[PDB]
Design a protein around this nucleic acid. Structure first.
Ligand SMILES: [Mg+2]
Ligand SMILES: [Mg+2]
Ligand SMILES: [Mg+2]
Ligand SMILES: [Mg+2]
Ligand SMILES: [Mg+2]
Ligand SMILES: [Mg+2]
Ligand SMILES: [Mg+2]
Ligand SMILES: [Mg+2]
Ligand SMILES: [Mg+2]
Ligand SMILES: [Mg+2]
Ligand SMILES: [Mg+2]
Ligand SMILES: [Mg+2]
Ligand SMILES: [Mg+2]
Ligand SMILES: [Mg+2]
Ligand SMILES: [Mg+2]
Ligand SMILES: [Mg+2]
Ligand SMILES: [Mg+2]
Ligand SMILES: [Mg+2]
Ligand SMILES: [Mg+2]
Ligand SMILES: [Zn+2]
Lengths: 25, 214, 97, 127, 63
RNA sequence: GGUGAAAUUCUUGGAUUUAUUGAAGACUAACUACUGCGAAAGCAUUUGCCAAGGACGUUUUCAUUAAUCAAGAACGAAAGUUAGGGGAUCGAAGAUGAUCAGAUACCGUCGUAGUCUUAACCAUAAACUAUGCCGACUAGGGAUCGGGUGGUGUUUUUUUAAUGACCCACUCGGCACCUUACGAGAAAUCAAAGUCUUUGGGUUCUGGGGGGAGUAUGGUCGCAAGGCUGAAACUUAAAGGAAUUG
RNA sequence: AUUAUUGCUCUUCAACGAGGAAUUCCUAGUAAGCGCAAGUCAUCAGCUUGCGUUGAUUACGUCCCUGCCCUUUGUACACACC
């Protein structure tokens, strides 16, 4: 896939792990 | 089931003084009826006629004039000055590449206190022997030219209203005094007053208006 | 690799020009990369000119052309206007006709 | 010699407007367009239609009282095409050939000291 | 009705996308000293005579 | 009206077209160029004010005060964020008309945020010449921008000048192009990407097969979006560059 | 020889009144019309391969349609756009 959408893919992904991890802070 | 054509009052338009044919054209109105009339309602329109149609001579093909109607007298409605334009084609044909264009303008008053903003444009010409293919001036050049043009324009206006200014523009003396004070800075070609618009006229004064009429 | 020294087109000593809008598809394109034509043409045409003067007051009149600049966008410039696509060497040639 | 009015032709694409008015503009005299003289949407601009509208316009022109006319031809303009539509040329010829007079004709398409964002977005109208 | 005879003085070539049409320069006989270029429909060589049904109007290209 | 063609849409509410006139906000057309300026982002209407700058001129002045730079800091397109204003236009989102097998799109319509401005954030772009800076040397040509020098050059008339604009020669410093190649390179190409195995003028920075991955983790900055710093396990024989023929 | 090989004779006497959208072939002893011999073949030509007989109209051009070829150009294809 186009680099930039992949960069967008993983931005999304980090915000998700960033979320799930806060459930346990 | 009407056809306003079998109902419309008809008319003819007369130019003012300092031109050629005062006879200008024709118009349609609406019978001066009790409640809404051919008089007060309109008449006071405007007409754009190329002064070459209005002076005859063709060394005047461009340059359009606004004639506004102010007063009326039975199948005979007069007009006064309302502005001047150029033609789009002439202008579009002075703006060649490889040369500097220069414009300047000022808002300024007359005697019969019309208030107007007049325009001015000129282009750097090649020196008749010059080898380099463009010829531009030097901003410092440009700045000075506009200040002198601006100087000359503020001078020439506040003559006897548009009337004499009108009389001033038609033989284009303005265009030449410019070139004269200018040629000591930088060449230049064309050089016209291009445009002049009216934005604040005084008060009717049926007298002075009638002074261009006979 | 690199395919031109003018890169896209004509910009050395600046950094940023200013976009124009393509006359055909409205695509923004930098002014120096533009690709331009002066559309100068008579108001009338090949046929109407005789019929013009004929049904006119004035001796032959004067006649005024229309002068307007065109800004195309490469894609629009290629798809019809000035384009061909030139061989490796012909591309170098900046002469017009 | 004649009685003068104003012709004023707006010729965009997809239709061509012809309509004559009093030399002042305030009071008009007959209109009719190219969309009027054919039914097909697609064929609204074409010279064939403008000719027909030039014909109708000429008729009422010298059926009311105007013998002659100056024309002010005009494209869309503004932040649009800036170039003359097809059926303004036809209309012109087909209103001189009609048997009317012609005197001094300039272009009046609105041209800005450019601006207001053009439509169609930066990537262009793409297809 | 006026007739108007013009003798083909030169063959210029073919136009018309099909290519059936032939450009040609003719010369009138009834008062020469004036030439016009016409578009013919049939086969043509030098020195043939076209009956120009009307006399003053020439074409150029053909699509 | 709009399109390849259509339709959604607007039309006794006289639409669209015309006329005179007014308001609002944005923008700076044509002139505009292988042209200018700035550290870079960037900068194009006029005039006034405010401070700034390079180049040039220089038998002025100081006299090594300099070059390059981890840390640290100023500025930093667009979008985006906070709080006001503004909100013409265009217009992520959304809703629609069509198209299509489908069509969350391309095309058309409505149009929210936004687009502009103030005060504060943000710190990223293919932020590009994909080419660090300072210094030296090495080869030809015609244009052009700025500055200066030289001329019983041209043109402007007045009474010759003085001016100005122009022409020729030269010279600094610019933005570029042309031709060559002694020379360089994997080539494309390159007055540097040259003066390199005959390998050293000074200095800063970065890379060390491809993925995994700019991911995980810690730190830090941010209101947020996110920025900076930045791994491994494991997997893999190629990924890749330039050019040639199909 | 029935589902009738072919041939003859009388009788029966259909559609078809020049053919929509479309589409084939052709430039001179050619097109078209006309028959013949040969192949096949015990018997069966409405088919073919050739042959001669009668003998035109209209082009002698072009790139519009369609098909192909050539340059240029792009490619991450080379098992080569299946
Ligand atoms: Mg919880
Ligand atoms: Mg390659
Ligand atoms: Mg490529
Ligand atoms: Mg940039
Ligand atoms: Mg396309
Ligand atoms: Mg401007
Ligand atoms: Mg640092
Ligand atoms: Mg520290
Ligand atoms: Mg808004
Ligand atoms: Mg949507
Ligand atoms: Mg849908
Ligand atoms: Mg959606
Ligand atoms: Mg970066
Ligand atoms: Mg770049
Ligand atoms: Mg050199
Ligand atoms: Mg000198
Ligand atoms: Mg290749
Ligand atoms: Mg046989
Ligand atoms: Mg067989
Ligand atoms: Zn385009």
């Amino acid at each position: 896939m186009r680099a930039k959408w992949r960069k967008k893919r993983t931005r999304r992904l980090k915000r998700k792990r960033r979320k799930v991890r806060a459930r346990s802070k | 089931v009407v056809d306003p054509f079998t109902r419309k009052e008809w008319f003819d338009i007369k130019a003012p003084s300092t031109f050629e044919n005062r006879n200008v054209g024709k118009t349609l109105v609406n019978k001066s009826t009790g409640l809404k009339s051919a008089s007060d309602a309109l008449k006071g329109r405007v007409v754009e006629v190329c002064l070459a149609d209005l002076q005859g001579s063709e060394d005047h093909s461009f340059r359009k004039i606004k004639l506004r109607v102010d007063e009326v007298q039975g199948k005979n409605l007069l007009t006064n000055f309302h502005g001047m334009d150029f033609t789009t084609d002439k202008l579009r044909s002075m703006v060649r590449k490889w040369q500097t264009l220069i414009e300047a303008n000022v808002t300024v008053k007359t005697s019969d206190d019309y208030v107007l903003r007049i325009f001015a444009i000129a282009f750097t010409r090649k020196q008749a022997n010059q080898v380099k293919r463009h010829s531009y001036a030097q901003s410092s050049h440009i700045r000075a030219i506009r200040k002198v043009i601006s100087e000359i324009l503020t001078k020439e206006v506040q003559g006897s209203t548009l009337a004499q200014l009108t009389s001033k523009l038609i033989p284009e003396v303005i265009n030449k005094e410019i070139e004269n004070a200018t040629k000591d800075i930088f060449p230049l070609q064309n050089i016209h007053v291009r445009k002049v618009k009216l934005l604040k006229q005084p008060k009717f004064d049926v007298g002075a208006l009638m002074a261009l009429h006979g | 690799p690199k395919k031109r020294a003018s890169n896209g087109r004509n910009k050395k000593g600046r950094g940023h020009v200013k976009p124009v809008r393509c006359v055909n598809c409205s695509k923004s394109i930098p002014k120096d990369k533009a690709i331009k034509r002066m559309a100068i043409r008579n108001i009338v045409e090949a046929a109407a000119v005789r019929d013009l003067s004929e049904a006119s007051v004035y001796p032959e009149y004067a006649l005024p052309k229309t002068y307007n600049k065109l800004h195309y966008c490469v894609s629009c410039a290629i798809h019809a206007r000035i384009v061909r696509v030139r061989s490796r060497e012909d591309r170098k040639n900046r002469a017009p006709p | 010699s004649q009685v003068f009015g104003v012709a004023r032709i707006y010729a965009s694409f997809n239709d061509t407007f012809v309509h004559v008015t009093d030399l002042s503009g305030k009071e008009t005299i007959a209109r009719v367009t190219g969309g009027m003289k054919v039914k097909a949407d697609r064929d609204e601009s074409s010279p064939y239609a403008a000719m027909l509208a030039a014909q109708d316009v000429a008729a009422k022109c010298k059926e009311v009282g105007i013998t002659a006319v100056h024309v002010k031809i005009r494209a869309t303009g503004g932040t649009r095409t800036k170039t003359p539509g097809p059926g303004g040329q036809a209309a012109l010829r087909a209103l001189a050939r009609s048997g009317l007079r012609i005197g001094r004709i300039e272009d009046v398409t609105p041209v800005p000291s450019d601006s207001t964002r053009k439509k169609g977005g930066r990537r262009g109208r793409r297809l | 009705t006026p007739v108007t005879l013009a003798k083909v003085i030169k063959v210029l070539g073919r136009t018309g996308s099909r290519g059936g049409v032939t450009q040609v320069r003719v010369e009138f006989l009834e008062d020469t000293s004036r030439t016009i270029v016409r578009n013919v429909k049939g086969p043509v060589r030098e020195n043939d005579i076209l009956v120009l049904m009307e006399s003053e109007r020439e074409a150029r290209r053909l699509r």
